[PDB]
């Protein structure tokens, strides 16, 4: 069958793209944003385990092997995801379709369908293969939707503006076609018969026609600008509103740049939604009318014009694909150069300490040379395209004048008719050229529409929640973990088996080493993530059946990584709460002990914090977070201050063993399980791992 290559949308969806290509090869089309979450793709990328898991979840029979160079020559299944390393820098996933003889044809999600020699592939190939078969429970289907039809629904509230633009364009075209005959009237009638009195009247009439044309262009330009602004705002706000509701596994599996980069997709979608639609429905009629008029003037000259526009279209179509390949290479080289520059500027201390200035100069010079080479390749492509287009246009104009002079000599037309034809040409070739120039715009906009709208299909956090409860209002009680398991998207399990009960209204401390998983329990208690197996009970109630708003409102979490957003001190403290008294704010700031330096700051509780509280220090920003958490007035408080009622449960996460001696209960988390529990004295006397780490660290 046809070789399907699904191109990537981001920099870290190689395995998802390969799995999508293989699924589409057998007749199963799905959005990339769903396969990306089935494979457990994250910032680091996809591993073969995720590919096998997702393929088995897609109905495929999946298997993973390590092969050798000679193993390739054997007969096996066609699709065959393979692992490569390009430039000896980063790993990558491709799809090796067929092996005729010594030639390996592969779908590369980053470039397209490419071919290597057997030696070259075996050099880049790492020996790992993912064998896929269409299982037994694999059902064909097409679970995607047309994104362009979806985004074309924004035009429905703008029908009046679209109609006004269409009418203005029609009037503009009619006036231009009418004004194209001024030179014909000049040469054939006024100049020939020396009509001085008429000349002025006809010239004034055509000047008035041109002024009306200018006014219509002004009006329709304003309308088009307003339409584009509206469509951009609508698409951007819809995308942002959906993104703000997605679960935390969406944000943890993607970079900030990936999420933000789709705000530039809105403009690309708007281009084909509005400008391409207007261009089609206007320039089609305009080109038809212009061609009819040109054929009325002269058949042979119209045929010459048709040949000219056909040659221009052929040249542009031929140069379309090479030009977009060079631009991508330039972007990649520029990204590499920018990364090198930023990384060398940030690490100037090390460079100066080790004397590696000449090395940095040479590396940057090499990267600049690479960027210049790519830029020259693209510039040469553009120069060749422009030279061919200019040859076609200029020779076509010369041949049109030549054949027009021939026809005038033969008596078929007149000179004024030839000049009027030269003007109506400007009213014929431009519409067809504009229609031809829509291919890159439409292709880019289709890619952007898929890239943006595949996220709008993702289920929101509230959608995934099961039925809630209208009788659980307070979260006070006992927090209990029943055989909780968790992994961060098809990776090594952070928690292997968790069993711990937190007494009601007490203070407890979970102890462990770096990477033990205490922060993972903190996140799991707040329903930022769900356990893959087990349960979390709060006062005899499942964590899943309690309202998400109540869970987020009655639980506070203060970590060493605080978040302050640009705004006044009071605005940061009143995050998410609108009607709050100022006395509560000052009381919370006093309890958090942030009431001193804030008053030391100018404007008191109005000090704007530039660049996420850059002026404030690390110690100060934590106190604002504590004040905010106290303002929340929660039932469970997880710290990484203490002035609340004794009924609230307090959880402490720390690697030190000294500040938590007075805690009621101490839970020791090692290797993802609660190895020991109880009070400090009991664990010290028990001679467990707590004793070992107390003797090693605190002696």
């Amino acid at each position: 069958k046809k070789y399907v290559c699904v191109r990537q949308y981001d920099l870290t969806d190689c395995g998802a793209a390969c799995l999508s290509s293989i699924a589409q090869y057998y007749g199963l089309k799905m959005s990339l944003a769903k396969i990306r979450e089935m494979t457990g793709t994250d910032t680091q990328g996809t591993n073969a385990y995720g590919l096998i898991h997702a393929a088995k979840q897609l109905g495929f029979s999946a298997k993973g092997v390590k092969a050798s160079k000679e193993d390739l020559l054997k007969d096996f299944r066609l699709p065959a995801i393979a692992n490569v390393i390009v430039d000896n820098r980063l790993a990558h996933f491709v799809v090796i379709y067929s092996i005729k003889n010594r030639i390996i044809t592969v779908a590369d999600p980053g470039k397209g369908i490419v071919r290597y020699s057997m030696d070259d592939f075996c050099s880049i190939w790492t020996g790992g293969l993912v064998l896929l078969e269409p299982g037994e429970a694999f059902q064909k289907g097409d679970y995607t939707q047309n994104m362009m039809v979806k985004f074309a629904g924004f035009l429905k509230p703008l029908k009046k503006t679209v109609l006004c633009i269409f009418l203005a364009s029609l009037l503009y075209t009619a006036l231009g076609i009418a004004g194209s005959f001024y030179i014909k009237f000049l040469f054939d009638d006024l100049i020939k018969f020396e009509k001085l009195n008429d000349l002025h009247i006809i010239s004034a009439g055509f000047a008035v026609i041109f002024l009306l044309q200018i006014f219509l262009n002004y009006y329709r330009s304003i309308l088009v600008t307003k339409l584009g602004m509206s469509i951009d705002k609508s698409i951007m706000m819809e995308y942002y509103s959906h993104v703000l509701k997605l679960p935390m596994n969406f944000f943890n599996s993607r970079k900030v740049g990936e999420i933000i980069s789709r705000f530039m997709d809105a403009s690309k979608i708007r281009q084909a939604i509005s400008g391409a639609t207007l261009t089609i429905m206007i320039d089609t009629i305009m080109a038809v009318i212009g061609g009819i008029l040109l054929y009325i003037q002269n058949s042979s000259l119209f045929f010459i014009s048709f040949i000219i526009i056909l040659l221009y279209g052929i040249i542009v179509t031929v140069f379309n694909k090479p030009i977009q390949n060079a631009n991508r290479q330039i972007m990649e080289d520029n990204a590499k150069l920018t990364s090198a520059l930023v990384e060398s500027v940030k690490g100037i201390e090390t460079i100066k300490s080790f004397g590696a200035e000449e090395q940095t100069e040479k590396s940057t010079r090499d990267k600049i040379e690479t960027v210049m080479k790519s830029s020259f390749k693209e510039g040469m492509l553009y120069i060749n395209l422009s030279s061919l287009t200019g040859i076609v246009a200029g020779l076509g104009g010369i041949v049109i004048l030549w054949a027009g002079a021939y026809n005038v000599i033969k008596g078929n037309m007149s000179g004024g008719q030839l000049l009027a034809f030269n003007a109506l040409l400007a009213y014929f070739l431009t519409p067809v050229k504009n229609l031809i120039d829509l291919q890159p715009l439409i292709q880019t906009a289709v890619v952007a529409s898929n890239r943006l709208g595949e996220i709008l299909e993702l289920a929101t956090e509230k959608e995934l929640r099961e039925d809630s409860d209208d009788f659980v209002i307070s979260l006070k009680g006992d927090i209990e973990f029943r055989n909780v398991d968790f992994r961060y998207g098809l990776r090594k399990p952070v928690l292997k088996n968790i069993n711990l009960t937190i007494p009601k209204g007490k203070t407890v401390a979970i102890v462990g080493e770096s990477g033990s998983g205490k922060t993972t329990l903190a996140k799991l208690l707040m329903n930022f993530y769900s356990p893959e197996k087990g349960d979390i009970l709060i006062n005899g109630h499942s964590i899943k059946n309690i309202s998400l708003e109540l869970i987020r409102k009655k639980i506070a979490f203060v970590s060493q990584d605080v978040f302050i957003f640009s705004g006044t001190v009071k605005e940061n403290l009143c995050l998410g709460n609108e009607n709050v008294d100022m006395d509560e704010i000052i009381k919370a700031a006093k309890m958090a002990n942030a009431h001193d330096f804030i008053e030391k700051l100018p404007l008191k509780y109005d000090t704007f914090l530039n660049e996420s509280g850059a002026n404030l220090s690390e110690g100060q920003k934590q106190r604002l977070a504590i004040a905010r958490a106290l303002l929340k007035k929660p039932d469970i408080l997880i710290l990484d201050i203490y002035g609340l009622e004794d009924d609230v449960t307090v959880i402490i996460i720390a690697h030190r063993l000294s500040t938590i001696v007075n805690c009621d209960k101490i839970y020791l988390l090692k290797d993802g399980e609660i190895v020991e529990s109880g009070s400090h004295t009991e664990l010290i006397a028990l001679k467990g791992c707590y004793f070992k780490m107390w003797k090693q660290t605190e002696n």
Binding site: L11, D13, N47, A48, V65, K66, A67, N83, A91, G128
Partner: peptide, 17 residues
């Protein structure tokens, strides 16, 4: 039946992206 079937530890080790 090419080569050797990789274990979950080895499957999680060959990555891409």
């Amino acid at each position: 039946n090419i080569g050797r079937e990789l274990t979950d530890e080895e499957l999680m080790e060959m990555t891409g992206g």
